[PDB]
Amino acid sequence: PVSVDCATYVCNGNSRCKQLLTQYTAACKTIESALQLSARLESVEVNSML
Amino acid sequence: PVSVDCATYVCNGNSRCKQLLTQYTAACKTIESALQLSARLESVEVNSMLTISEEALQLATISSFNGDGYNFTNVLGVSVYDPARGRVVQKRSFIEDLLFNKVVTNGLGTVDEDYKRCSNGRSVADLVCAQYYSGVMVLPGVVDAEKLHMYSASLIGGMVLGGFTAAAALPFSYAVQARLNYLALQTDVLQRNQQLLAES
Amino acid sequence: TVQLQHNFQAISSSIDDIYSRLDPPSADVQVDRLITGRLSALNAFVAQTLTKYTEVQASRKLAQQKVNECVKSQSQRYGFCGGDGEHIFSLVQAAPQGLL
Amino acid sequence: FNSAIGNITSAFESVKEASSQTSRGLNTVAHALTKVQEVVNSQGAALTQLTVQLQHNFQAISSSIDDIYSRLDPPSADVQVDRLITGRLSALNAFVAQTLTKYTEVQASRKLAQQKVNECVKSQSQRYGFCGGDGEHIFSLVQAAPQGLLFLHTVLVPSDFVDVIAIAGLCVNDEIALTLREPGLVLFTHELQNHTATEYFVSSRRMFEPRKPTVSDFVQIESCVVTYVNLTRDQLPDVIPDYIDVNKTR
Amino acid sequence: YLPIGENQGVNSTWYCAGQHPTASGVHGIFVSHIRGGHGFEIGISQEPFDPSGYQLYLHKATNGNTNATARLRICQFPSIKTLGPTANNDVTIGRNCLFNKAIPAHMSEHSVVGITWDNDRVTVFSDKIYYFYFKNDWSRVATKCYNSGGCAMQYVYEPTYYMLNVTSAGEDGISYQPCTANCIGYAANVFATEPNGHIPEGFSFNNWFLLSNDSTLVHGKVVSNQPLLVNCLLAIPKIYGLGQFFSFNQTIDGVCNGAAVQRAPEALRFNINDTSVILAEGSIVLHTALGTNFSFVCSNSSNPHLATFAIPLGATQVPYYCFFKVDTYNSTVYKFLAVLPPTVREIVITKYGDVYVNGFGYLHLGLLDAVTINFTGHGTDDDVSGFWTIASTNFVDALIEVQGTAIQRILYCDDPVSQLKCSQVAFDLDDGFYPFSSRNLLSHEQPISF
Amino acid sequence: FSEQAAYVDDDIVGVISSLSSSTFNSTRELPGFFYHSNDGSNCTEPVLVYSNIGVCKSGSIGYVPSQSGQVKIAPTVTGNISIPTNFSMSIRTEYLQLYNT
Numbered sequence A: 001p002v003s004v005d006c007a008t009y010v011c012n013g014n015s016r017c018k019q020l021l022t023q024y025t026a027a028c029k030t031i032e033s034a035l036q037l038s039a040r041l042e043s044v045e046v047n048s049m050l
Numbered sequence B: 001p002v003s004v005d006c007a008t009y010v011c012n013g014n015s016r017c018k019q020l021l022t023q024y025t026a027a028c029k030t031i032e033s034a035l036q037l038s039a040r041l042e043s044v045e046v047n048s049m050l051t052i053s054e055e056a057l058q059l060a061t062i063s064s065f066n067g068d069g070y071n072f073t074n075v076l077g078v079s080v081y082d083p084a085r086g087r088v089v090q091k092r093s094f095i096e097d098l099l100f101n102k103v104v105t106n107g108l109g110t111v112d113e114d115y116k117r118c119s120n121g122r123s124v125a126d127l128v129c130a131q132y133y134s135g136v137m138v139l140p141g142v143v144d145a146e147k148l149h150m151y152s153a154s155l156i157g158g159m160v161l162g163g164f165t166a167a168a169a170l171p172f173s174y175a176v177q178a179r180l181n182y183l184a185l186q187t188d189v190l191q192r193n194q195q196l197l198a199e200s
Numbered sequence C: 001t002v003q004l005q006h007n008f009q010a011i012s013s014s015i016d017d018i019y020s021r022l023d024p025p026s027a028d029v030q031v032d033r034l035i036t037g038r039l040s041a042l043n044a045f046v047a048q049t050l051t052k053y054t055e056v057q058a059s060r061k062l063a064q065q066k067v068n069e070c071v072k073s074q075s076q077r078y079g080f081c082g083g084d085g086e087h088i089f090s091l092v093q094a095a096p097q098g099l100l
Numbered sequence D: 001f002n003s004a005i006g007n008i009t010s011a012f013e014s015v016k017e018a019s020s021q022t023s024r025g026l027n028t029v030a031h032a033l034t035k036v037q038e039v040v041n042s043q044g045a046a047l048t049q050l051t052v053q054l055q056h057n058f059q060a061i062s063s064s065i066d067d068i069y070s071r072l073d074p075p076s077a078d079v080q081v082d083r084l085i086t087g088r089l090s091a092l093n094a095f096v097a098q099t100l101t102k103y104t105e106v107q108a109s110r111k112l113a114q115q116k117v118n119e120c121v122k123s124q125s126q127r128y129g130f131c132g133g134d135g136e137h138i139f140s141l142v143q144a145a146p147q148g149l150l151f152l153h154t155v156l157v158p159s160d161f162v163d164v165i166a167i168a169g170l171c172v173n174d175e176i177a178l179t180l181r182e183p184g185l186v187l188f189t190h191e192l193q194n195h196t197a198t199e200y201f202v203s204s205r206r207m208f209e210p211r212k213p214t215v216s217d218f219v220q221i222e223s224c225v226v227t228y229v230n231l232t233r234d235q236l237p238d239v240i241p242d243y244i245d246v247n248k249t250r
Numbered sequence E: 001y002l003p004i005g006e007n008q009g010v011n012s013t014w015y016c017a018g019q020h021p022t023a024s025g026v027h028g029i030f031v032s033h034i035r036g037g038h039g040f041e042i043g044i045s046q047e048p049f050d051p052s053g054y055q056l057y058l059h060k061a062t063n064g065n066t067n068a069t070a071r072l073r074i075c076q077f078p079s080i081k082t083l084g085p086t087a088n089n090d091v092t093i094g095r096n097c098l099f100n101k102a103i104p105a106h107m108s109e110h111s112v113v114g115i116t117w118d119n120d121r122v123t124v125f126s127d128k129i130y131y132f133y134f135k136n137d138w139s140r141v142a143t144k145c146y147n148s149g150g151c152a153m154q155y156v157y158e159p160t161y162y163m164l165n166v167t168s169a170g171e172d173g174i175s176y177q178p179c180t181a182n183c184i185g186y187a188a189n190v191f192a193t194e195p196n197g198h199i200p201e202g203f204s205f206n207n208w209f210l211l212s213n214d215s216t217l218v219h220g221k222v223v224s225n226q227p228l229l230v231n232c233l234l235a236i237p238k239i240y241g242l243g244q245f246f247s248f249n250q251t252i253d254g255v256c257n258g259a260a261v262q263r264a265p266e267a268l269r270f271n272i273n274d275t276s277v278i279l280a281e282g283s284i285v286l287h288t289a290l291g292t293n294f295s296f297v298c299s300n301s302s303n304p305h306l307a308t309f310a311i312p313l314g315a316t317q318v319p320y321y322c323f324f325k326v327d328t329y330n331s332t333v334y335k336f337l338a339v340l341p342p343t344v345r346e347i348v349i350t351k352y353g354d355v356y357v358n359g360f361g362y363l364h365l366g367l368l369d370a371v372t373i374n375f376t377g378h379g380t381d382d383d384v385s386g387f388w389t390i391a392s393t394n395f396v397d398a399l400i401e402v403q404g405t406a407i408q409r410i411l412y413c414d415d416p417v418s419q420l421k422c423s424q425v426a427f428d429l430d431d432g433f434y435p436f437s438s439r440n441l442l443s444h445e446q447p448i449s450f
Numbered sequence F: 001f002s003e004q005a006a007y008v009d010d011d012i013v014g015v016i017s018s019l020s021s022s023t024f025n026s027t028r029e030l031p032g033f034f035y036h037s038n039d040g041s042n043c044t045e046p047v048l049v050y051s052n053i054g055v056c057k058s059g060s061i062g063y064v065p066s067q068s069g070q071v072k073i074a075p076t077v078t079g080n081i082s083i084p085t086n087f088s089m090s091i092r093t094e095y096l097q098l099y100n101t
């Protein structure tokens, strides 16, 4: 299970960069959303596996 | 299935831009071809697996059904005459009704917008028209959700269809007994023996 | 859709504006920037769509076998029909692009 | 079989020949041959696309590098070539992922193919409708294909139905519940002896192969039910030619 | 390989019988007469009997004429040996199929249905012109004929060339006969421009150059805008005793050969056939956007300004330096046009100064207006002219099939089916759903809104 | 606006368009769009199939009916049952790719 802080990953933690990052809107959100979705799906399915 | 006017998705009909796109060869064309290939495939197989039996459709309504100890009210889809052009239809089962209305953000998939009104172009345009004007077309679902429901009804009827015709719609207790004997021969099927399973 | 918003390092996302603001050579140069961006983003959309197409293809296959070998009749394949135990049968209801 | 093979072979012999697309789409020859068509096209398509990518002067002064080196000082030439470098590798990446996608899929395919040859070819499998279509898969054939195999699953389809009356079981003298042990059988009377002679026959649950039953096919049951046929001991030889009345023989 | 005709010329050797002649090295075949519908069977197979290639067979034993469809197939079919639609032979009926649409064999009694296979291109005369670029080694023929006037069917081992006036359309007024000493090029420079202004199908592009702007594709297909619309086609074989001022903005004034569009052209393409025309200087005189006059002089010398281009050599033997004198008041120099290439085939020029040479834009300078000619093709020079055809040309988008940097076939894009084809990349397209654009205003005439 | 061309029979027998009309004397309305052809007749046989729609070779358009499948008699324990009999053995086709080059 791996996740990334898209915002600080790109913006280097700079909010002044986050200003521009927000303009891409869900470009940042979808990444992490899908990542955690897959991770949680994997977790639950393997927990039911065992 | 989704199609795109790649030509306009890039050029937006700009002639000079189209000429520039020409140099990129069939990359756009290959893309669109792959898209349509996938769509047509998807269609052909999903149509292939969907096979509906009419006798099953007969047995598939609640009134036709004999849920002997098997309370299928939410299970089955109600079949009533549809005033829509005199045709009789079977509305989807209560369960699927809940699933769609509560889960689908618009309840049902029939919300698929005609681009006829999109070609109307008189009033302001919605998101569907915004993307259509971007050259984005949403081909409707290959198979109806109502077709899906009636297919499921066909599945259920075939589940309870004990013969080639409608004269062999045995009570579902008989089918359960058969499947049990399939997995394990029954030495004594008491009334409670079947009933407990039914009520549980 | 939002890709068209992205001015791919050009001066604008408006092709006609680029033509207006530049001589043909430089204009075609700049529009190529977004042309590439659009094409690329579209390509990625293509691949991911195929990805979903493929997996759902396998999915529908699995559903097909499940219905044939469990729904049409209970399977001797223990545990196969939606989990372990003596699966006496199963029943299917419709779902958005799917089945229960 | 001779029919089917020949006229399917004809279906191969042309496209939309005789408008025989009642057998259209999946599980039909057209579907498979189409698939193979895209199969053979795809590799060349991807390779050619990758090749054609590199001509695009990706934001650089030219699609080739030594011109960049010659025309300007190396530092700037490095600057420009960076964009080409990125473009080339990026296209490689997308191609790579596409290829892997293909590898993943075909890997799934071969897994299924090996399953299919095991379950369907080396023996006929009881799992219903598994071998490329519903019905009883008697067996199948296989033929080579570009990067793949075609499988020809022979499956019976009834032309008729015998509307027989099944028997839940017997209760002889209202005393002994006797029932077929085997779930896969059906006891009935039909044809002229459906009701005229009540000749009892057992046949496959799957299909119609009637024959007289045998006591060896029956078993005692603790509980009678009203569905069971009332019977008498003298009817046991009548019902079963294989029954023996031990007491009278003694 | 035209029909050899029934009596004119040497020709004769008409088979026209159930004799079932089988001759090798045949490249033309014609049936000038089926007596209503009486049988006709032709088997065109590679003489070494190679099934690797696509075999060919035409069969019509039935005598229904229109309904006695000649079962035609360019397919890997039974290389039928003696007689019969299939017969006893090698290769099964459906080994490999390329074309099998049985085209009906309805024709007039004096009508001729013919096929020629040459230069890896196939032309078919079954009621139309079916011109295609496709590989072929089909010099084996096995026949069955029913005699029809003694001049029904013939093999053709040699090419016959017929000059046609075409005073009238149809069987009448063609004035057909084997004629003229301008055999090849004037049979490869003329055409009958379609009323739309296109090249009729059947043209082989004897010397036609695709306009590659830098570097020529050797083999493939490309959709591009090339001046394939024909305006007032002029095809004068080896005669130009003309002092002419070709001008844009005006449909080029000449004896417009085919069903020409009387449209003011923007380009013009040549099918020149003698090189000495360039030796006769003044063949190209020019007036450009500035109005500056312009001369063209080709000669072995390389310096007009240090030496006279008074040519001491004739019939080349030296690639003649072509220099292009500026003829304005404050510029009177000879720009080196080009070292004369070993052999020019076709030259095309455009309104916007596109001096295009043999598939190359040597100059493509600012817009030209007056492309004036003084090629001294007068007197006996009226039989020395290189001018063999010239056609005014309008740019048109079309898909071009080319092999070995040689034009094979064309497809315009105006028609919606053709529009989809050129929108696609293949001349042929498959039955499916394809993207398309709603037809805009054909006349641009876009009003301004501010 | 974007449109679809039904290039069947190597011909644009019909055009799917959001626009009501086209250069076709024949036109049917679909729930999502318009179809324009020189044949608005009731497409009995889809020479081409797409989504739930089928198109005939003349430009006729219609909706593809679902193909009913082979009946399987559900197992029972008694009563009347139609035992299948006199089977014709038909061969179904199934291609599987084995590898990529």
Ligand SMILES: *[C@@H]1O[C@H](CO)[C@@H](O[C@@H]2O[C@H](CO)[C@@H](O[C@@H]3O[C@H](CO[C@H]4O[C@H](CO)[C@@H](O)[C@H](O)[C@@H]4O)[C@@H](O)[C@H](O[C@H]4O[C@H](CO)[C@@H](O)[C@H](O)[C@@H]4O)[C@@H]3O)[C@H](O)[C@H]2NC(C)=O)[C@H](O)[C@H]1NC(C)=O
Pocket: E211, E212, E213, E225, E266, E352, E354, E356, E361, E364, E395
């Ligand atoms: C080698 O490379 C050179 C590079 O420039 C090419 O030169 C250009 O070639 C193109 C190809 O045809 C020429 O395009 C034509 O331009 C003509 C003049 O342009 C005016 O008109 C267009 C269109 O109206 C305007 O957009 C433009 O701003 C000018 O006002 C036009 O007459 C042609 O348009 C035709 O079609 C349109 C519809 O699409 C009609 O409305 C027009 O009336 C007309 O019928 C066409 O657009 C381009 O002009 C060339 N450059 C120059 C500077 O002229 C060579 O062609 C290329 N190949 C060689 C050398 O063989």
Ligand SMILES: *[C@@H]1O[C@H](CO)[C@@H](O[C@@H]2O[C@H](CO)[C@@H](O[C@@H]3O[C@H](CO)[C@@H](O)[C@H](O)[C@@H]3O)[C@H](O)[C@H]2NC(C)=O)[C@H](O)[C@H]1NC(C)=O
Pocket: E078, E086, E087, E088, E089, E091, E092, E093
């Ligand atoms: C089994 O089916 C095959 C079909 O594949 C039959 O084989 C075919 O038999 C013919 C008989 O001569 C072979 O020649 C063909 O003959 C016809 C009639 O003369 C002719 O018109 C053809 O041009 C060809 O010469 C043919 O090659 C052969 N194979 C094929 C068609 O693939 C076979 O007879 C059948 N046998 C049984 C027992 O059913």
Ligand SMILES: *[C@@H]1O[C@H](CO)[C@@H](O[C@@H]2O[C@H](CO)[C@@H](O[C@@H]3O[C@H](CO)[C@@H](O)[C@H](O)[C@@H]3O)[C@H](O)[C@H]2NC(C)=O)[C@H](O)[C@H]1NC(C)=O
Pocket: E181, E182, E183, E184, E185, E186, E207, E237, E238, E271, E272, E273, E274, E344, E345, E383, E388
């Ligand atoms: C263009 O096509 C012609 C086809 O005729 C090719 O050959 C040339 O044809 C002309 C016919 O008008 C020949 O003219 C004749 O020349 C002889 C001697 O040269 C003369 O005695 C005759 O009276 C007549 O004028 C011409 O010679 C001949 N060219 C040759 C033989 O080299 C020509 O090659 C084609 N060229 C191109 C570039 O397409």
Ligand SMILES: *[C@@H]1O[C@H](CO)[C@@H](O[C@@H]2O[C@H](CO)[C@@H](O[C@@H]3O[C@H](CO)[C@@H](O)[C@H](O)[C@@H]3O)[C@H](O)[C@H]2NC(C)=O)[C@H](O)[C@H]1NC(C)=O
Pocket: F025, F026, F037, F038, F039, F040, F058, F059
């Ligand atoms: C809209 O225009 C199209 C294009 O002309 C019409 O389609 C075709 O119209 C002809 C003229 O009647 C029909 O021909 C008729 O049937 C046969 C064809 O050979 C023959 O006996 C006659 O030629 C007879 O006139 C042809 O069937 C028809 N094709 C179609 C409809 O696919 C069309 O009729 C026009 N009207 C509409 C679409 O309402």
Ligand SMILES: *[C@@H]1O[C@H](CO[C@@H]2O[C@@H](C)[C@@H](O)[C@@H](O)[C@@H]2O)[C@@H](O[C@@H]2O[C@H](CO)[C@@H](O)[C@H](O)[C@H]2NC(C)=O)[C@H](O)[C@H]1NC(C)=O
Pocket: E163, E164, E165, E166, E167, E168, E175, E176
């Ligand atoms: C057609 O040619 C004639 C010249 O006579 C031709 O001679 C041969 C070349 C032959 O192949 C045929 O073309 C002609 O018979 C041109 O003018 C005609 O000349 C004849 C001579 O007497 C005269 O009777 C006609 O009235 C003329 N006009 C015609 C036939 O229309 C003519 O210009 C050429 N082209 C056309 C389109 O007719």
Ligand SMILES: *[C@@H]1O[C@H](CO)[C@@H](O[C@@H]2O[C@H](CO)[C@@H](O)[C@H](O)[C@H]2NC(C)=O)[C@H](O)[C@H]1NC(C)=O
Pocket: B071, B072, B073, B074
């Ligand atoms: C069978 O199911 C039906 C509905 O699935 C049950 O009927 C509903 O019971 C609820 C209980 O709160 C009531 O509120 C509804 O008004 C009933 N009718 C509906 C939903 O139409 C029924 O109780 C079940 N058992 C039977 C019929 O024996």
Ligand SMILES: *[C@@H]1O[C@H](CO)[C@@H](O[C@@H]2O[C@H](CO)[C@@H](O)[C@H](O)[C@H]2NC(C)=O)[C@H](O)[C@H]1NC(C)=O
Pocket: B167, B168, D163, D164, D165, F079, F080, F081
């Ligand atoms: C099968 O079902 C039918 C109807 O449910 C049963 O009733 C018979 O129906 C047929 C008409 O199809 C009549 O000819 C018979 O007379 C009916 N039976 C009686 C006892 O009257 C039928 O018994 C069932 N079993 C079969 C047909 O074997």
Ligand SMILES: *[C@@H]1O[C@H](CO)[C@@H](O[C@@H]2O[C@H](CO)[C@@H](O)[C@H](O)[C@H]2NC(C)=O)[C@H](O)[C@H]1NC(C)=O
Pocket: D174, D225, D226, D227, D228, D229, D230
């Ligand atoms: C066989 O004999 C049994 C025993 O008499 C019969 O069962 C009776 O059926 C009637 C029909 O309603 C009931 O009222 C009785 O209560 C049953 N008695 C029992 C179960 O002991 C049965 O009907 C006879 N026939 C068959 C075909 O089973």
Ligand SMILES: *[C@@H]1O[C@H](CO)[C@@H](O[C@@H]2O[C@H](CO)[C@@H](O)[C@H](O)[C@H]2NC(C)=O)[C@H](O)[C@H]1NC(C)=O
Pocket: B085, F041, F042, F043, F062, F063
């Ligand atoms: C024509 O095609 C349509 C399908 O779009 C079919 O629609 C029928 O039209 C009549 C006209 O009055 C209605 O009464 C029917 O109810 C319609 N049928 C359905 C299922 O809605 C029609 O069947 C076709 N005509 C034929 C096949 O002859």
Ligand SMILES: *[C@@H]1O[C@H](CO)[C@@H](O[C@@H]2O[C@H](CO)[C@@H](O)[C@H](O)[C@H]2NC(C)=O)[C@H](O)[C@H]1NC(C)=O
Pocket: D159, D160, F085, F086, F087
């Ligand atoms: C094949 O199907 C037929 C149709 O039900 C079965 O019965 C035959 O019916 C025809 C009708 O006239 C008779 O002429 C035949 O004599 C019947 N028998 C046969 C063997 O054809 C037939 O029983 C079925 N065959 C099998 C093997 O089940």
Ligand SMILES: *[C@@H]1O[C@H](CO)[C@@H](O)[C@H](O)[C@H]1NC(C)=O
Pocket: D002, D003, D004, D006, D007, D008, D020
């Ligand atoms: C082949 O298939 C077609 C379509 O079902 C059928 O009409 C024909 O009789 C078949 N021929 C043979 C020999 O099976």
Ligand SMILES: *[C@@H]1O[C@H](CO)[C@@H](O)[C@H](O)[C@H]1NC(C)=O
Pocket: E241, E242, E243, E244, E373, E374
């Ligand atoms: C040659 O050019 C002169 C002018 O330079 C012009 O008057 C004449 O028409 C042209 N042609 C001939 C044959 O003299």
Ligand SMILES: *[C@@H]1O[C@H](CO)[C@@H](O)[C@H](O)[C@H]1NC(C)=O
Pocket: E248, E249
């Ligand atoms: C161009 O042609 C038009 C109409 O034929 C004419 O009015 C105009 O004067 C011409 N201009 C030139 C420069 O030839």
Ligand SMILES: *[C@@H]1O[C@H](CO)[C@@H](O)[C@H](O)[C@H]1NC(C)=O
Pocket: E287, E291, E292, E293, E370
């Ligand atoms: C030569 O140039 C003059 C002016 O530059 C011009 O008037 C004249 O027309 C030109 N010659 C020809 C033959 O057009």
Ligand SMILES: *[C@@H]1O[C@H](CO)[C@@H](O)[C@H](O)[C@H]1NC(C)=O
Pocket: E329, E330
């Ligand atoms: C040529 O152009 C120059 C540039 O202005 C000008 O000074 C000169 O007078 C011109 N030559 C003439 C008019 O002969």
